[PDB]
Design an enzyme around this catalytic site. Structure first.
Site, PDB file in Angstrom:
ATOM      1  N   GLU A  73       3.225   6.175  -4.951  1.00 24.48           N
ATOM      2  CA  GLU A  73       4.500   5.829  -4.346  1.00 24.48           C
ATOM      3  C   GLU A  73       5.623   5.929  -5.381  1.00 24.48           C
ATOM      4  OE1 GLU A  73       3.379   1.536  -3.491  1.00 24.48           O
ATOM      5  OE2 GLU A  73       5.356   1.341  -4.498  1.00 24.48           O
ATOM      6  N   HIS A 102       8.539  -0.046   5.229  1.00 23.48           N
ATOM      7  CA  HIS A 102       7.586  -0.856   4.491  1.00 23.48           C
ATOM      8  C   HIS A 102       6.174  -0.596   5.019  1.00 23.48           C
ATOM      9  CE1 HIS A 102       7.036  -4.217   1.570  1.00 23.48           C
ATOM     10  NE2 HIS A 102       5.936  -4.448   2.343  1.00 23.48           N
TER      11      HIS A 102
END
Length: 110
Positions: A73, A102
Site C-alpha cells: 500500500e 478504507h
C-alpha cells in the site's frame, strides 16, 4: 522535483522505475523515529513525507491474487495528520488498484 502522492502519479511512477518515490517510509521506520499513529503525529516526526511501501496483506480477498503474489500500500492524497482512507494498492506483478473507502471497495486503474 515535486513530491508525488496522487493515485495516477504514483501509479505511473511505479510502472516506470519499479519502486516508490523515496518520500515514503515504512510504519517501522516511522515508529523508530517516534511516530505514534495514536498521536497522529506523522507530519511532526517527518514533515512532508508520507507512509508507503508497507504491506497491505490482502486477507479479505478484496483485491485479486493467489498466494505467491503480495500486495503493498501507499498513502494517497496525504497532507498531514493521521493516515487516511485514500490509498493506492500495487502488487509485485504490477496490478494497481485504488480505494477511497478504507478497504471497502477497489477500482482497477492499471
Amino acid at each position: 522535483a515535486q513530491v508525488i502522492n496522487t493515485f495516477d502519479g504514483v501509479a505511473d511512477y511505479l510502472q516506470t522505475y519499479h519502486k516508490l518515490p523515496d518520500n515514503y517510509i515504512t510504519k517501522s521506520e516511522a515508529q523508530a523515529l517516534g511516530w505514534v499513529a495514536s498521536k497522529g503525529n506523522l507530519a511532526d516526526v517527518a514533515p512532508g513525507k508520507s507512509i508507503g511501501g508497507d504491506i497491505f496483506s490482502n486477507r479479505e480477498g478484496k483485491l485479486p491474487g493467489k498466494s505467491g503474489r503480495t500486495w503493498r500500500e501507499a498513502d494517497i492524497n496525504y497532507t498531514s495528520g493521521f493516515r487516511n482512507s485514500d490509498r493506492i494498492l500495487y502488487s509485485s506483478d504490477w496490478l494497481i488498484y485504488k480505494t477511497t473507502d478504507h478497504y471497502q471497495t477497489f477500482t482497477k486503474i492499471r
